[PDB]
Subunit: 120 residues, 3 copies
């Protein structure tokens, strides 16, 4: 049966089943679910990927285990900035991904990422 993954600190941050980690769509939220870094896509992207990494790590994996990222943005003018930070977190062989533009849960949010990883 699935394990939930809740790093020290109606969905959980991630789940683990049969060696597959599913990380929830993650935004740049403070502890009160307010958006951090309102007008700054680079710092939002960094905060998101740091959270995702901690979920995967809590499960026993690393970012190299990520097979797929689902990226959701609100403006294509931010794509270059988001990509720049994203690449820093995946230095080796890159995951597969999509990046689509849509609406996100809070008005200041500029990016959200959900992630699938295969761990040992």
């Amino acid at each position: 049966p699935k394990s939930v993954i809740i790093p020290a600190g109606p969905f959980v941050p991630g789940t683990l089943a049969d060696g597959v980690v599913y990380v929830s769509g993650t935004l740049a939220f403070d502890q009160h679910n307010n958006v951090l870094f309102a007008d700054d896509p680079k710092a939002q992207t960094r905060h998101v990927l740091e959270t995702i990494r901690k979920v995967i790590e809590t499960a026993g994996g690393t970012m190299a285990d990520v097979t797929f990222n689902s990226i959701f943005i609100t403006d294509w003018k931010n794509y270059a900035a988001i990509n720049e930070i994203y690449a820093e977190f995946f230095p080796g062989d890159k995951p597969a991904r999509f990046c689509i533009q849509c609406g996100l849960v809070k008005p200041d949010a500029l990016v959200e990422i959900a992630t699938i990883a295969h761990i040992a």
Copy 2:
């Protein structure tokens, strides 16, 4: 193929499910993993039920998703991830309230985004992954 060990995916079509709006099945099952198609609050003949009622639409959607997962041999507790699509954030609270009812105990991972849906009266759509073997 099947005789060689690579068992093909099984399509999952619950007893009574009606004709789909496009070329897809209610769900697929391969190697113990169930992929449920994006599910909307459709009647037979693919009209949207409960036009201005996001709670009733969410309930109908999760009942359908549950039947797919049960037909495949699992339960809602096996769901690892849900992809939720909505048209209006004013409905988020209502959708969440019903959603919670269907996943008592440890909750799945999920996302929820706002986008366009295949019919104008549709307020919510959900796709689902479940590990059942």
Copy 3:
């Protein structure tokens, strides 16, 4: 899981790869109808875009060692419901016999002329 994921980059073809393979599962990136310079081919033709996209996806899956019949799920993104029937018509040609599960939603895509984008999950022999 102990063995790292394999990237799938078919001979001849931003920080992603066309697909990954791990434990018999192929994740194909969201694929659009791009030429060699990342311009959208077939600007006002959703059918020809869809065909190009599904041929790309097929080649990724084949490079990984599978076929389209191994596809378990497709995520489809479109810009205009007026194009839904057309996209569906071409989609069906690529999955004869038991169809995958899928979703189709309307959203924004990376280039204005893109009319469809598809990402795919497949379970291949292993």
